[PDB]
Amino acid sequence: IHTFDDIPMPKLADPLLIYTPANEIFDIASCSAKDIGFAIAHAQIPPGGGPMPHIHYFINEWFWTPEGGIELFHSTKQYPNMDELPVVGGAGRGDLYSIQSEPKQLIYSPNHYMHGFVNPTDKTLPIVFVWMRNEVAPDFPYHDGGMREYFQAVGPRITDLNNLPELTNAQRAAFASEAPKYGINQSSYFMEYVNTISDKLPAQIAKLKNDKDLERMVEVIEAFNRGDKSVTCS
Amino acid sequence: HTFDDIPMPKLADPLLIYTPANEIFDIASCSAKDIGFAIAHAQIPPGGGPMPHIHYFINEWFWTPEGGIELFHSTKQYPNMDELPVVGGAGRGDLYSIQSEPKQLIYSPNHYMHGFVNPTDKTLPIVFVWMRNEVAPDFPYHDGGMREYFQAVGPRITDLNNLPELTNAQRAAFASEAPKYGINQSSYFMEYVNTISDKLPAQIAKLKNDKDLERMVEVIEAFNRGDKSVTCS
Ligand SMILES: [Cu+2]
Numbered sequence A: 001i002h003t004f005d006d007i008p009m010p011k012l013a014d015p016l017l018i019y020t021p022a023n024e025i026f027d028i029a030s031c032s033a034k035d036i037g038f039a040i041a042h043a044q045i046p047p048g049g050g051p052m053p054h055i056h057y058f059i060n061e062w063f064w065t066p067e068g069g070i071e072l073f074h075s076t077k078q079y080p081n082m083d084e085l086p087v088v089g090g091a092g093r094g095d096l097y098s099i100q101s102e103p104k105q106l107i108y109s110p111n112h113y114m115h116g117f118v119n120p121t122d123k124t125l126p127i128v129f130v131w132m133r134n135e136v137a138p139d140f141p142y143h144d145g146g147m148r149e150y151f152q153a154v155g156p157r158i159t160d161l162n163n164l165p166e167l168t169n170a171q172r173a174a175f176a177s178e179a180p181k182y183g184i185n186q187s188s189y190f191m192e193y194v195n196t197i198s199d200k201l202p203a204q205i206a207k208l209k210n211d212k213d214l215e216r217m218v219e220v221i222e223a224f225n226r227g228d229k230s231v232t233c234s
Numbered sequence B: 001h002t003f004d005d006i007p008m009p010k011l012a013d014p015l016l017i018y019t020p021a022n023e024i025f026d027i028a029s030c031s032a033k034d035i036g037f038a039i040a041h042a043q044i045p046p047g048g049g050p051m052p053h054i055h056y057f058i059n060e061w062f063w064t065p066e067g068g069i070e071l072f073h074s075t076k077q078y079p080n081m082d083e084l085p086v087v088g089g090a091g092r093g094d095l096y097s098i099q100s101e102p103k104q105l106i107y108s109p110n111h112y113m114h115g116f117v118n119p120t121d122k123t124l125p126i127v128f129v130w131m132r133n134e135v136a137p138d139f140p141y142h143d144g145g146m147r148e149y150f151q152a153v154g155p156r157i158t159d160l161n162n163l164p165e166l167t168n169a170q171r172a173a174f175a176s177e178a179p180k181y182g183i184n185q186s187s188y189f190m191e192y193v194n195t196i197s198d199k200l201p202a203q204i205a206k207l208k209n210d211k212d213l214e215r216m217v218e219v220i221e222a223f224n225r226g227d228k229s230v231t232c233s
Protein backbone atom coordinates (compact mmCIF):
# COMPACT_ATOMS: atom_id res chain seq x y z
CA ILE A 1 0.00 0.00 0.00
CA HIS A 2 1.32 3.39 -1.12
CA THR A 3 0.99 6.00 1.62
CA PHE A 4 1.84 9.69 2.12
CA ASP A 5 2.53 11.39 5.43
CA ASP A 6 0.68 14.71 5.08
CA ILE A 7 -1.05 16.97 2.56
CA PRO A 8 -1.48 20.39 4.23
CA MET A 9 -4.25 22.87 3.41
CA PRO A 10 -3.44 26.40 2.20
CA LYS A 11 -4.93 28.59 4.88
CA LEU A 12 -6.87 31.39 3.20
CA ALA A 13 -7.94 34.56 5.04
CA ASP A 14 -11.48 33.83 3.85
CA PRO A 15 -11.75 30.04 3.47
CA LEU A 16 -14.05 28.70 0.74
CA LEU A 17 -16.28 26.08 2.39
CA ILE A 18 -18.70 24.33 0.06
CA TYR A 19 -21.23 21.60 0.51
CA THR A 20 -21.11 19.68 -2.73
CA PRO A 21 -24.22 18.20 -4.38
CA ALA A 22 -22.48 14.85 -3.84
CA ASN A 23 -22.85 15.32 -0.04
CA GLU A 24 -19.25 16.25 0.71
CA ILE A 25 -18.03 19.02 2.99
CA PHE A 26 -15.21 20.87 1.17
CA ASP A 27 -12.62 23.36 2.32
CA ILE A 28 -11.12 24.25 -1.04
CA ALA A 29 -8.49 26.58 -2.50
CA SER A 30 -6.63 27.15 -5.80
CA CYS A 31 -2.85 27.61 -5.92
CA SER A 32 -0.38 28.45 -8.59
CA ALA A 33 3.26 29.10 -9.14
CA LYS A 34 5.44 29.60 -12.19
CA ASP A 35 5.47 25.92 -13.09
CA ILE A 36 2.18 24.52 -11.76
CA GLY A 37 -1.48 25.16 -10.92
CA PHE A 38 -3.91 23.08 -8.88
CA ALA A 39 -6.85 22.96 -6.56
CA ILE A 40 -6.87 21.16 -3.25
CA ALA A 41 -9.71 20.35 -0.91
CA HIS A 42 -9.68 19.03 2.63
CA ALA A 43 -13.01 17.25 2.81
CA GLN A 44 -15.25 15.47 5.26
CA ILE A 45 -17.48 12.77 3.81
CA PRO A 46 -20.61 11.91 5.81
CA PRO A 47 -22.05 8.37 5.52
CA GLY A 48 -23.17 7.74 1.96
CA GLY A 49 -21.34 10.73 0.53
CA GLY A 50 -19.21 10.89 -2.61
CA PRO A 51 -19.43 11.58 -6.34
CA MET A 52 -20.93 9.29 -8.93
CA PRO A 53 -18.39 7.91 -11.43
CA HIS A 54 -16.74 10.49 -13.61
CA ILE A 55 -13.78 11.15 -15.87
CA HIS A 56 -11.42 14.21 -15.98
CA TYR A 57 -9.91 15.90 -19.04
CA PHE A 58 -8.09 18.94 -17.57
CA ILE A 59 -6.54 17.54 -14.39
CA ASN A 60 -4.80 14.62 -12.76
CA GLU A 61 -6.20 13.70 -9.31
CA TRP A 62 -4.83 12.38 -6.06
CA PHE A 63 -6.97 11.02 -3.25
CA TRP A 64 -5.45 10.81 0.26
CA THR A 65 -7.42 9.04 2.97
CA PRO A 66 -6.07 9.84 6.46
CA GLU A 67 -8.38 7.32 8.22
CA GLY A 68 -9.00 4.98 5.25
CA GLY A 69 -12.62 3.75 5.29
CA ILE A 70 -13.44 5.43 1.98
CA GLU A 71 -14.31 3.01 -0.86
CA LEU A 72 -13.04 4.20 -4.21
CA PHE A 73 -14.02 2.88 -7.62
CA HIS A 74 -11.58 2.95 -10.49
CA SER A 75 -11.40 1.76 -14.10
CA THR A 76 -8.57 -0.02 -15.89
CA LYS A 77 -9.79 1.49 -19.16
CA GLN A 78 -9.02 5.03 -20.22
CA TYR A 79 -11.51 7.30 -22.01
CA PRO A 80 -9.37 9.83 -23.89
CA ASN A 81 -12.20 11.55 -25.85
CA MET A 82 -14.53 13.83 -23.88
CA ASP A 83 -17.06 13.77 -26.75
CA GLU A 84 -17.56 10.02 -26.34
CA LEU A 85 -19.60 9.27 -23.19
CA PRO A 86 -19.11 5.81 -21.63
CA VAL A 87 -22.85 5.03 -21.85
CA VAL A 88 -24.96 2.08 -23.02
CA GLY A 89 -26.12 3.77 -26.18
CA GLY A 90 -22.66 4.90 -27.23
CA ALA A 91 -19.07 3.89 -26.66
CA GLY A 92 -20.14 1.64 -23.75
CA ARG A 93 -20.11 1.49 -19.97
CA GLY A 94 -16.99 0.64 -17.95
CA ASP A 95 -15.72 -2.03 -15.61
CA LEU A 96 -14.76 -0.57 -12.22
CA TYR A 97 -12.75 -2.00 -9.33
CA SER A 98 -13.22 -1.05 -5.70
CA ILE A 99 -10.37 0.04 -3.42
CA GLN A 100 -10.93 -0.29 0.33
CA SER A 101 -8.76 2.66 1.39
CA GLU A 102 -6.35 2.35 4.29
CA PRO A 103 -5.01 5.04 6.66
CA LYS A 104 -2.88 7.63 4.74
CA GLN A 105 -3.24 5.72 1.49
CA LEU A 106 -2.47 7.85 -1.57
CA ILE A 107 -4.34 7.02 -4.73
CA TYR A 108 -3.27 8.56 -8.02
CA SER A 109 -5.78 8.83 -10.82
CA PRO A 110 -4.54 10.24 -14.16
CA ASN A 111 -6.79 12.02 -16.57
CA HIS A 112 -9.05 9.88 -18.67
CA TYR A 113 -9.57 7.14 -16.04
CA MET A 114 -13.09 6.68 -14.62
CA HIS A 115 -13.35 6.92 -10.90
CA GLY A 116 -15.61 7.71 -8.03
CA PHE A 117 -16.00 7.02 -4.35
CA VAL A 118 -18.38 6.52 -1.46
CA ASN A 119 -18.25 6.49 2.32
CA PRO A 120 -19.99 3.17 2.98
CA THR A 121 -19.53 3.41 6.77
CA ASP A 122 -21.38 5.14 9.63
CA LYS A 123 -18.38 7.43 10.34
CA THR A 124 -17.76 10.87 8.83
CA LEU A 125 -14.47 10.27 7.06
CA PRO A 126 -11.70 12.66 6.05
CA ILE A 127 -10.30 12.78 2.55
CA VAL A 128 -8.00 15.21 0.73
CA PHE A 129 -8.16 15.74 -3.02
CA VAL A 130 -5.55 17.39 -5.16
CA TRP A 131 -6.46 18.23 -8.76
CA MET A 132 -3.40 19.40 -10.78
CA ARG A 133 -3.80 21.24 -14.08
CA ASN A 134 -2.62 19.03 -16.93
CA GLU A 135 -0.92 20.18 -20.16
CA VAL A 136 -4.08 20.67 -22.26
CA ALA A 137 -6.22 22.45 -19.71
CA PRO A 138 -7.53 25.85 -20.77
CA ASP A 139 -6.64 28.80 -18.52
CA PHE A 140 -9.23 29.34 -15.80
CA PRO A 141 -9.33 32.44 -13.59
CA TYR A 142 -7.43 30.67 -10.80
CA HIS A 143 -5.08 28.91 -13.30
CA ASP A 144 -5.88 25.62 -11.61
CA GLY A 145 -7.31 23.61 -14.46
CA GLY A 146 -10.92 24.29 -13.55
CA MET A 147 -11.83 22.16 -10.51
CA ARG A 148 -12.34 24.87 -7.84
CA GLU A 149 -14.28 26.93 -10.41
CA TYR A 150 -16.51 23.85 -10.92
CA PHE A 151 -17.20 23.27 -7.22
CA GLN A 152 -17.75 26.94 -6.55
CA ALA A 153 -20.19 27.08 -9.49
CA VAL A 154 -22.16 23.99 -8.47
CA GLY A 155 -22.04 23.76 -4.67
CA PRO A 156 -23.63 26.05 -2.10
CA ARG A 157 -21.28 27.95 0.15
CA ILE A 158 -21.26 26.80 3.77
CA THR A 159 -21.94 30.17 5.49
CA ASP A 160 -23.11 28.47 8.69
CA LEU A 161 -20.74 25.83 10.02
CA ASN A 162 -23.47 24.25 12.18
CA ASN A 163 -26.24 24.06 9.53
CA LEU A 164 -25.34 22.61 6.16
CA PRO A 165 -27.09 24.24 3.20
CA GLU A 166 -30.08 22.56 1.60
CA LEU A 167 -29.28 20.73 -1.63
CA THR A 168 -31.89 21.15 -4.33
CA ASN A 169 -32.86 19.08 -7.35
CA ALA A 170 -31.44 21.86 -9.62
CA GLN A 171 -28.09 21.79 -7.84
CA ARG A 172 -27.91 17.99 -8.10
CA ALA A 173 -28.76 18.12 -11.80
CA ALA A 174 -26.23 20.97 -12.35
CA PHE A 175 -23.49 18.95 -10.66
CA ALA A 176 -23.64 16.62 -13.65
CA SER A 177 -24.79 19.06 -16.40
CA GLU A 178 -22.20 21.85 -15.80
CA ALA A 179 -19.26 19.40 -15.41
CA PRO A 180 -18.19 19.34 -19.10
CA LYS A 181 -17.57 23.09 -18.92
CA TYR A 182 -14.80 22.21 -16.46
CA GLY A 183 -13.45 19.24 -18.43
CA ILE A 184 -15.42 16.59 -16.50
CA ASN A 185 -17.89 13.98 -17.73
CA GLN A 186 -19.90 13.48 -14.56
CA SER A 187 -22.59 10.78 -14.38
CA SER A 188 -25.93 11.68 -12.81
CA TYR A 189 -26.58 8.19 -11.34
CA PHE A 190 -24.30 5.44 -10.19
CA MET A 191 -24.90 2.89 -12.97
CA GLU A 192 -24.85 5.37 -15.89
CA TYR A 193 -21.19 4.82 -16.80
CA VAL A 194 -20.77 1.46 -15.02
CA ASN A 195 -21.01 -2.07 -16.31
CA THR A 196 -19.59 -3.99 -13.34
CA ILE A 197 -18.02 -3.33 -9.94
CA SER A 198 -15.43 -5.93 -8.98
CA ASP A 199 -13.46 -6.35 -5.75
CA LYS A 200 -10.31 -7.86 -7.31
CA LEU A 201 -8.12 -4.80 -7.91
CA PRO A 202 -5.75 -5.08 -10.92
CA ALA A 203 -2.07 -4.36 -10.07
CA GLN A 204 -1.75 -1.78 -12.87
CA ILE A 205 -4.34 0.51 -11.22
CA ALA A 206 -2.89 -0.28 -7.85
CA LYS A 207 0.59 0.76 -9.01
CA LEU A 208 -0.32 4.20 -10.39
CA LYS A 209 1.65 7.01 -8.73
CA ASN A 210 3.06 10.49 -9.15
CA ASP A 211 4.65 11.56 -5.90
CA LYS A 212 6.96 14.07 -7.65
CA ASP A 213 4.10 16.36 -8.66
CA LEU A 214 2.36 15.94 -5.29
CA GLU A 215 5.58 16.84 -3.48
CA ARG A 216 5.88 19.98 -5.62
CA MET A 217 2.30 21.03 -4.87
CA VAL A 218 2.97 20.45 -1.18
CA GLU A 219 6.02 22.77 -1.45
CA VAL A 220 3.75 25.37 -3.02
CA ILE A 221 1.12 25.09 -0.26
CA GLU A 222 3.71 25.15 2.50
CA ALA A 223 5.37 28.22 0.90
CA PHE A 224 2.07 30.07 0.65
CA ASN A 225 1.37 29.25 4.29
CA ARG A 226 4.74 30.86 5.25
CA GLY A 227 3.84 34.06 3.35
CA ASP A 228 6.01 33.42 0.28
CA LYS A 229 4.69 35.80 -2.40
CA SER A 230 6.17 33.92 -5.40
CA VAL A 231 3.19 31.56 -5.19
CA THR A 232 -0.45 32.41 -4.85
CA CYS A 233 -3.31 30.60 -3.18
CA SER A 234 -6.80 32.07 -3.14
CA HIS B 1 -38.65 -16.31 -20.11
CA THR B 2 -41.35 -14.07 -21.51
CA PHE B 3 -44.97 -13.25 -20.84
CA ASP B 4 -47.41 -11.98 -23.44
CA ASP B 5 -49.31 -9.30 -21.50
CA ILE B 6 -50.10 -8.07 -18.00
CA PRO B 7 -53.20 -5.86 -18.25
CA MET B 8 -53.89 -2.91 -15.99
CA PRO B 9 -57.04 -2.69 -13.89
CA LYS B 10 -58.80 0.41 -15.27
CA LEU B 11 -59.92 2.63 -12.41
CA ALA B 12 -62.42 5.44 -12.97
CA ASP B 13 -59.70 7.82 -11.81
CA PRO B 14 -56.30 6.20 -12.28
CA LEU B 15 -53.87 6.70 -9.41
CA LEU B 16 -50.86 8.31 -11.01
CA ILE B 17 -47.82 8.73 -8.70
CA TYR B 18 -44.28 9.95 -9.37
CA THR B 19 -42.11 7.87 -7.07
CA PRO B 20 -39.09 9.21 -5.24
CA ALA B 21 -37.14 6.67 -7.33
CA ASN B 22 -38.06 8.75 -10.46
CA GLU B 23 -40.71 6.31 -11.72
CA ILE B 24 -43.98 7.38 -13.34
CA PHE B 25 -46.62 4.97 -11.90
CA ASP B 26 -50.19 4.14 -12.89
CA ILE B 27 -50.92 1.99 -9.84
CA ALA B 28 -53.81 0.01 -8.30
CA SER B 29 -54.44 -2.53 -5.60
CA CYS B 30 -56.60 -5.64 -6.11
CA SER B 31 -57.87 -8.39 -3.90
CA ALA B 32 -60.13 -11.41 -4.10
CA LYS B 33 -60.84 -14.17 -1.56
CA ASP B 34 -57.52 -16.02 -1.98
CA ILE B 35 -55.13 -13.24 -3.10
CA GLY B 36 -54.09 -9.58 -2.79
CA PHE B 37 -51.62 -7.51 -4.81
CA ALA B 38 -50.65 -4.13 -6.20
CA ILE B 39 -49.80 -3.55 -9.85
CA ALA B 40 -48.22 -0.60 -11.64
CA HIS B 41 -47.83 0.12 -15.33
CA ALA B 42 -44.82 2.42 -15.21
CA GLN B 43 -42.67 4.54 -17.41
CA ILE B 44 -39.06 4.88 -16.28
CA PRO B 45 -37.15 7.95 -17.39
CA PRO B 46 -33.38 7.75 -18.08
CA GLY B 47 -31.63 7.02 -14.79
CA GLY B 48 -34.90 6.19 -13.03
CA GLY B 49 -35.42 3.17 -10.80
CA PRO B 50 -35.02 2.12 -7.20
CA MET B 51 -31.74 1.61 -5.43
CA PRO B 52 -31.13 -1.89 -4.02
CA HIS B 53 -33.80 -3.11 -1.60
CA ILE B 54 -35.33 -6.28 -0.12
CA HIS B 55 -39.01 -7.11 0.41
CA TYR B 56 -40.53 -8.89 3.43
CA PHE B 57 -44.26 -8.67 2.60
CA ILE B 58 -44.45 -9.38 -1.15
CA ASN B 59 -43.10 -11.39 -4.09
CA GLU B 60 -42.37 -9.14 -7.07
CA TRP B 61 -42.67 -9.59 -10.81
CA PHE B 62 -41.04 -7.27 -13.34
CA TRP B 63 -42.23 -7.28 -16.93
CA THR B 64 -40.26 -5.31 -19.53
CA PRO B 65 -42.34 -4.89 -22.69
CA GLU B 66 -39.40 -3.30 -24.58
CA GLY B 67 -36.51 -4.73 -22.56
CA GLY B 68 -33.84 -2.07 -22.08
CA ILE B 69 -34.24 -1.90 -18.32
CA GLU B 70 -31.27 -3.26 -16.34
CA LEU B 71 -32.15 -5.21 -13.21
CA PHE B 72 -29.88 -6.22 -10.36
CA HIS B 73 -30.48 -9.25 -8.16
CA SER B 74 -28.69 -11.19 -5.44
CA THR B 75 -28.28 -14.94 -5.08
CA LYS B 76 -28.25 -14.48 -1.29
CA GLN B 77 -31.44 -14.10 0.68
CA TYR B 78 -31.91 -11.81 3.64
CA PRO B 79 -34.79 -13.33 5.62
CA ASN B 80 -34.56 -11.08 8.73
CA MET B 81 -35.75 -7.48 8.24
CA ASP B 82 -33.70 -6.44 11.30
CA GLU B 83 -30.50 -7.65 9.60
CA LEU B 84 -29.51 -5.19 6.87
CA PRO B 85 -26.99 -6.05 4.13
CA VAL B 86 -24.37 -3.80 5.77
CA VAL B 87 -21.21 -4.19 7.83
CA GLY B 88 -22.53 -5.18 11.25
CA GLY B 89 -25.69 -6.82 9.92
CA ALA B 90 -25.82 -9.40 7.14
CA GLY B 91 -22.88 -7.86 5.24
CA ARG B 92 -22.98 -5.97 1.94
CA GLY B 93 -24.04 -8.23 -0.92
CA ASP B 94 -23.12 -9.37 -4.38
CA LEU B 95 -25.48 -8.34 -7.17
CA TYR B 96 -25.88 -9.75 -10.68
CA SER B 97 -27.23 -7.68 -13.55
CA ILE B 98 -29.94 -8.57 -16.02
CA GLN B 99 -30.20 -6.73 -19.32
CA SER B 100 -33.87 -7.21 -19.98
CA GLU B 101 -35.31 -8.24 -23.34
CA PRO B 102 -38.70 -7.51 -24.89
CA LYS B 103 -41.60 -9.07 -22.93
CA GLN B 104 -39.17 -10.64 -20.44
CA LEU B 105 -40.70 -11.56 -17.10
CA ILE B 106 -38.40 -11.53 -14.08
CA TYR B 107 -39.61 -13.07 -10.83
CA SER B 108 -38.07 -11.98 -7.55
CA PRO B 109 -39.18 -13.74 -4.37
CA ASN B 110 -39.24 -12.02 -1.01
CA HIS B 111 -35.87 -11.71 0.79
CA TYR B 112 -33.77 -11.28 -2.36
CA MET B 113 -31.98 -8.04 -2.85
CA HIS B 114 -32.89 -6.35 -6.09
CA GLY B 115 -33.20 -3.10 -7.98
CA PHE B 116 -33.23 -1.71 -11.45
CA VAL B 117 -32.30 1.23 -13.59
CA ASN B 118 -33.09 2.57 -17.03
CA PRO B 119 -29.50 3.02 -18.23
CA THR B 120 -30.59 4.33 -21.68
CA ASP B 121 -31.38 7.87 -22.87
CA LYS B 122 -35.05 7.22 -23.60
CA THR B 123 -38.01 6.63 -21.30
CA LEU B 124 -38.91 2.88 -21.06
CA PRO B 125 -42.04 0.95 -19.96
CA ILE B 126 -42.11 -1.65 -17.15
CA VAL B 127 -44.93 -3.38 -15.30
CA PHE B 128 -44.66 -4.36 -11.68
CA VAL B 129 -46.70 -6.87 -9.76
CA TRP B 130 -46.26 -7.06 -6.00
CA MET B 131 -48.16 -10.00 -4.49
CA ARG B 132 -49.04 -10.16 -0.79
CA ASN B 133 -47.00 -13.10 0.54
CA GLU B 134 -47.41 -15.78 3.28
CA VAL B 135 -46.66 -13.54 6.28
CA ALA B 136 -47.68 -9.98 5.22
CA PRO B 137 -49.79 -8.03 7.72
CA ASP B 138 -53.15 -6.64 6.67
CA PHE B 139 -53.04 -3.22 4.99
CA PRO B 140 -56.17 -1.19 4.03
CA TYR B 141 -56.10 -2.42 0.38
CA HIS B 142 -55.10 -5.95 1.51
CA ASP B 143 -52.26 -5.84 -1.00
CA GLY B 144 -49.19 -6.48 1.19
CA GLY B 145 -48.31 -2.80 1.54
CA MET B 146 -46.76 -1.64 -1.72
CA ARG B 147 -49.42 0.73 -3.03
CA GLU B 148 -49.83 2.29 0.41
CA TYR B 149 -46.07 2.82 0.51
CA PHE B 150 -45.89 4.66 -2.84
CA GLN B 151 -49.04 6.66 -2.10
CA ALA B 152 -47.61 7.81 1.24
CA VAL B 153 -44.13 8.81 0.04
CA GLY B 154 -44.62 10.02 -3.52
CA PRO B 155 -46.59 12.86 -5.07
CA ARG B 156 -49.63 12.47 -7.26
CA ILE B 157 -49.00 13.35 -10.88
CA THR B 158 -51.40 16.12 -11.86
CA ASP B 159 -49.97 16.51 -15.38
CA LEU B 160 -47.82 13.96 -17.24
CA ASN B 161 -46.23 16.82 -19.22
CA ASN B 162 -45.31 18.76 -16.04
CA LEU B 163 -44.21 16.13 -13.53
CA PRO B 164 -44.18 17.04 -9.85
CA GLU B 165 -40.81 17.97 -8.31
CA LEU B 166 -39.71 15.49 -5.69
CA THR B 167 -38.88 17.00 -2.31
CA ASN B 168 -36.03 16.14 -0.01
CA ALA B 169 -38.62 14.96 2.58
CA GLN B 170 -40.14 12.54 0.04
CA ARG B 171 -36.77 11.06 -0.93
CA ALA B 172 -35.81 10.75 2.73
CA ALA B 173 -39.14 9.03 3.49
CA PHE B 174 -38.80 6.61 0.57
CA ALA B 175 -35.90 5.16 2.61
CA SER B 176 -36.97 5.93 6.17
CA GLU B 177 -40.58 4.67 5.95
CA ALA B 178 -39.85 1.61 3.88
CA PRO B 179 -39.65 -0.84 6.81
CA LYS B 180 -43.24 0.02 7.92
CA TYR B 181 -44.24 -1.39 4.50
CA GLY B 182 -41.93 -4.41 4.65
CA ILE B 183 -39.05 -3.03 2.63
CA ASN B 184 -35.43 -2.41 3.53
CA GLN B 185 -34.60 0.35 1.04
CA SER B 186 -31.03 1.63 0.63
CA SER B 187 -30.58 5.45 0.36
CA TYR B 188 -27.59 5.30 -1.98
CA PHE B 189 -26.83 2.75 -4.68
CA MET B 190 -23.77 1.05 -3.19
CA GLU B 191 -24.99 1.06 0.47
CA TYR B 192 -26.00 -2.63 0.44
CA VAL B 193 -23.61 -3.63 -2.37
CA ASN B 194 -20.20 -5.25 -2.52
CA THR B 195 -19.94 -6.21 -6.19
CA ILE B 196 -22.00 -6.04 -9.38
CA SER B 197 -21.34 -8.76 -11.94
CA ASP B 198 -22.65 -9.35 -15.47
CA LYS B 199 -22.40 -13.18 -15.24
CA LEU B 200 -25.94 -14.14 -14.30
CA PRO B 201 -26.12 -17.21 -12.12
CA ALA B 202 -28.49 -19.96 -13.26
CA GLN B 203 -30.10 -20.05 -9.78
CA ILE B 204 -31.36 -16.47 -10.48
CA ALA B 205 -32.16 -16.98 -14.19
CA LYS B 206 -34.46 -19.89 -13.32
CA LEU B 207 -36.64 -18.04 -10.81
CA LYS B 208 -40.26 -18.16 -11.93
CA ASN B 209 -43.83 -18.20 -10.67
CA ASP B 210 -46.20 -18.09 -13.64
CA LYS B 211 -49.05 -19.72 -11.73
CA ASP B 212 -49.54 -16.83 -9.23
CA LEU B 213 -49.14 -14.25 -12.02
CA GLU B 214 -51.82 -16.04 -14.06
CA ARG B 215 -54.13 -15.92 -10.98
CA MET B 216 -53.54 -12.19 -10.57
CA VAL B 217 -54.15 -11.53 -14.28
CA GLU B 218 -57.45 -13.36 -13.93
CA VAL B 219 -58.38 -11.02 -11.03
CA ILE B 220 -57.47 -7.93 -13.07
CA GLU B 221 -59.40 -9.17 -16.13
CA ALA B 222 -62.44 -10.03 -14.01
CA PHE B 223 -62.29 -6.61 -12.37
CA ASN B 224 -62.14 -4.99 -15.79
CA ARG B 225 -65.24 -6.96 -16.86
CA GLY B 226 -67.13 -5.57 -13.87
CA ASP B 227 -67.05 -8.72 -11.70
CA LYS B 228 -67.87 -7.61 -8.16
CA SER B 229 -66.39 -10.67 -6.44
CA VAL B 230 -62.95 -9.01 -6.75
CA THR B 231 -61.98 -5.43 -5.93
CA CYS B 232 -59.50 -3.07 -7.56
CA SER B 233 -59.11 0.55 -6.38
CU1 LIG C 1 -12.45 13.09 -9.85
Ligand SMILES: [Cu+2]
Pocket (backbone or CB within 6 Å): B053, B055, B060, B114
Ligand atom coordinates in the same frame (compact mmCIF):
# COMPACT_ATOMS: atom_id res chain seq x y z
CU1 LIG D 1 -38.74 -4.37 -5.17
